[PDB]
Ligand binder design. Structure first.
Ligand code: HEM
Ligand SMILES: O=C1N[C@@H](Cc2ccc(O)c(I)c2)C(=O)N[C@H]1Cc1ccc(O)cc1
Length: 394
């Protein structure tokens, strides 16, 4: 006798399990068991993943309802699952989105300068270097302090909340609440700090004192800072880290992008397509009975949208495991989601990776892993797939 198929399948972020392709072919929507013991529908084809993400009756907000089948325990207050809705309802969506584009004057130069400084320090210290803890994550942290308008020196403490905040746990996590409450208090103080006049927090601080926002809660303003720092830093740092592995594993591509840096945007788009950074399918709760392929999903059931199911689907991306810079549908992947909850930071995430890769290839054109790839330690029970250390030489 066999147990119901368990998710997630593998915490390894350097390769897709052969099992995903078999599953997509045989059962592109299939029942699975999550780490909480809940049942869920796992969707793994491009067509069905898109259908779910574009139908708001598959609700993000409702996943936080008491008594719902859960993918994992909440690590934030339940109302924060509706963060973007709360921002929109407060009239802040346009301002928040404008503050997190890569377009502010000086931002791209700051990114380049930071990347080059991190890499110079690694070169001075000598190989081996850890490209996650000493390059990709500090680059993400520094970027997000700049985008938020907060002091660079405050970045590391906020960053250290994230190894817990983005856990994928069967049970509530006491440390997540301690760190959340502290980080909210920090952002509330930022909003009261007259020196904070730039970036997202500088803009929110002004809007907070504008009559058109006088009934928006101080809690929401602080929440925007905590959430955009956390989501952005974990997502950009984790994506860049695993993208560097995929690049290092492809010397011909590394060399092509080093020789022709104008191809880096196309390369990053393919690295996004093949990225395994999200450790679990994206969760949604059905708010009606909805046909998805051969399954009638019932109201109240949990649906998990497997991004790599869509992104490696050969019916949409032929030769899906290959990085090809000339595809006709290159941004049509689901790395940033799709529909109501499409990533509001997509342009910034692209530029973070493009600048980080450009700087790395210029400074370390001979970059290579310093350990066999199987020696990387993949973090478990986390909402991203990342190697604990990424040891390289050059
Ligand atoms: C390459 C880096 C990134 C990747 C791969 C990525 C991926 C994603 C994905 C897949 C979603 C959709 C989640 C869902 O539908 O359930 C999402 C949402 C989100 N992302 Fe990004 N993201 C990245 C960068 C960023 C950055 C730089 C920020 C902010 C500075 C950010 C903030 C958010 C927020 C706040 C949401 C939630 C939107 C919502 O609930 O409606 N992300 N991201
Ligand atoms: O904006 C938010 N929208 C939703 C949806 C969401 C869930 C998980 C993700 O990875 C992403 I991207 C988005 C949420 O539930 N929360 C935030 C992100 C956040 C920020 C700080 C935290 O500590 C935890 C989660």
């Amino acid at each position: 006798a066999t147990v119901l198929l368990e998710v997630p399948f593998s915490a390894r972020g350097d390769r897709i399990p052969d099992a995903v392709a078999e599953l997509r072919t045989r059962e592109p929507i299939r029942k699975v068991r999550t780490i909480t013991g809940a049942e869920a529908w796992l969707v793994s084809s491009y067509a069905l993943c898109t259908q779910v993400l574009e139908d708001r009756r598959f609700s993000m907000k409702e996943t936080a309802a008491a008594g719902a089948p859960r993918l994992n325990a909440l690590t934030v207050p339940p109302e924060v699952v509706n963060n973007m809705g709360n921002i929109a309802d407060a009239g802040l969506r346009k301002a928040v989105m404008k503050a997190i584009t890569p377009k502010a004057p000086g931002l791209e130069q700051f990114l380049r300068d930071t990347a080059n400084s991190l890499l110079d320090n690694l070169i001075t210290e000598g190989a081996p270097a850890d490209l996650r803890n000493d390059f990709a994550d500090p680059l993400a942290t520094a970027l997000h302090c700049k985008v938020l308008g907060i002091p660079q020196e405050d970045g590391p403490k906020l960053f250290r909340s994230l190894s817990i905040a983005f856990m994928s746990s069967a049970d509530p996590i006491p440390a997540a609440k301690i760190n959340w409450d502290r980080d909210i208090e920090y952002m509330a103080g930022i909003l009261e700090n007259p020196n904070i006049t730039t970036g997202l927090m500088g803009e929110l601080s002004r809007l907070r004192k504008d009559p058109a926002y006088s009934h928006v809660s101080d809690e929401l303003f602080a929440t925007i800072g905590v959430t955009f720092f956390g989501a952005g830093v974990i997502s950009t740092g984790s994506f860049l880290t695993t993208a560097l592995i995929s690049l290092i594993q492809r010397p011909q591509l590394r060399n092509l992008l080093h020789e022709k840096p104008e191809l880096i945007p196309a390369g990053v788009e393919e690295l996004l397509r093949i990225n395994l950074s999200f450790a679990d399918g994206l969760p949604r709760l059905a708010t009606a009975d909805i046909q998805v392929g051969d399954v009638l999903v019932r109201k109240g059931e949990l649906v998990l949208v497997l991004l790599e199911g869509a992104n490696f689907d050969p019916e949409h991306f032929p030769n899906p495991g290959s990085i090809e810079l000339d595809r006709p549908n290159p941004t049509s992947h689901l790395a940033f989601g799709r529909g109501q909850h499409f990533c509001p930071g997509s342009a910034l995430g692209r530029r973070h990776a493009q600048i980080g890769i450009e700087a790395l290839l210029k400074k370390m054109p001979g970059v290579d892993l310093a350990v066999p790839i199987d020696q990387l330690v993949w973090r478990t029970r986390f909402q991203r797939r990342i190697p604990e250390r990424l040891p390289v030489l050059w």
